[PDB]
Design a binder for this molecule. Sequence first.
Ligand SMILES: CCCCCCCC/C=C/CCCCCCCC(=O)OC[C@H](O)CO
Ligand SMILES: CCCCCCCC/C=C\CCCCCCCC(=O)OC[C@H](O)CO
Ligand SMILES: CCCCCCCC/C=C\CCCCCCCC(=O)OC[C@H](O)CO
Ligand SMILES: CCCCCCCC/C=C\CCCCCCCC(=O)OC[C@H](O)CO
Ligand SMILES: *C/C=C(C)/C=C/C=C(C)/C=C/C1=C(C)CCCC1(C)C
Length: 231
Amino acid sequence: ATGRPEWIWLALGTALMGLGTLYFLVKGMGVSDPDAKKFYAITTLVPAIAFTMYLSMLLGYGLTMVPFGGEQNPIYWARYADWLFTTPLLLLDLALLVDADQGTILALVGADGIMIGTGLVGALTKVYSYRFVWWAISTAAMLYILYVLFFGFTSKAESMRPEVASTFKVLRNVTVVLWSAYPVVWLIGSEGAGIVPLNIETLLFMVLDVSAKVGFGLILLRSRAIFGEAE
Ligand SMILES: CCCCCCCC/C=C/CCCCCCCC(=O)OC[C@H](O)CO
Ligand SMILES: CCCCCCCC/C=C\CCCCCCCC(=O)OC[C@H](O)CO
Ligand SMILES: CCCCCCCC/C=C\CCCCCCCC(=O)OC[C@H](O)CO
Ligand SMILES: CCCCCCCC/C=C\CCCCCCCC(=O)OC[C@H](O)CO
Ligand SMILES: *C/C=C(C)/C=C/C=C(C)/C=C/C1=C(C)CCCC1(C)C
């Protein structure tokens, strides 16, 4: 399984996701506040899922070959199985922080499923030019999510506890910057135009994934915003 040069970044990603999961798991022991328990559960599950899918890519299970451009291209399909479940969970963390209404949560999770689903279809599409049609639709769904996080959540966070408002603003900014890089890496990497080779593309996704999941979680789980206001 070491014949693929990208294996070193899959192994590092597996290890870092695993260590993140164990740290959040141990840190969440003894927490009794029901509000904080919700945030620990959502946030510990995110790196646990990513751990299993990085492991499946490392061992070669989460990889398939897709013919396009007259070549058999290696496509790591396990990323989308990871993102299908972990990106909604991350948006739930943000939505619960600001006490978002139920209709807005459904809009966000539904647009997020369309984003990952069409990205998977584009990844597996065999007609080269059609791959970028799905990329554009997926990116439109992303822009909807980013809009809601700015012109819907930021307006309500400012009317809540100051620790909640400040923590949301930081996590919102982290999320908007990190998530926007994903469509760019896909477009210039092996799934799209093929300008960057697969080993470098895999390194880039690994840095983004660990930052968006473990880095995100470290900021959230250290704030007092996840506990209820109590004496
Ligand atoms: C938190 C502290 C850790 C900070 C870590 C942040 C670093 C992120 C790195 C990124 C991209 C690296 C890209 C390396 C590109 C090498 C490609 C290359 O030069 O190949 C030459 C080619 O053969 C002829 O052009
Ligand atoms: C080397 C280590 C590899 C990485 C570890 C293997 C991960 C796969 C195993 C297990 C699922 C464990 C539980 C995952 C669910 C955690 C949810 C949680 O902790 O919630 C706390 C909440 O407060 C309670 O009500
Ligand atoms: C709050 C919601 C919590 C949700 C928790 C769910 C976490 C599931 C994790 C992992 C395994 C993913 C396995 C995906 C199975 C794919 C198998 C498959 O279809 O392979 C086809 C063929 O055999 C080969 O190409
Ligand atoms: C819209 C309301 C919310 C506002 C939130 C602000 C965040 C905006 C950021 C990004 C979108 C992603 C852009 C990806 C498009 C890159 C395509 C490109 O320019 O590639 C050119 C060429 O192919 C290569 O040299
Ligand atoms: C845990 C990993 C995270 C937060 C992954 C985020 C992934 C995305 C925001 C993916 C976006 C994509 C597009 C908008 C278009 C091209 C295909 C995708 C799926 C990479």
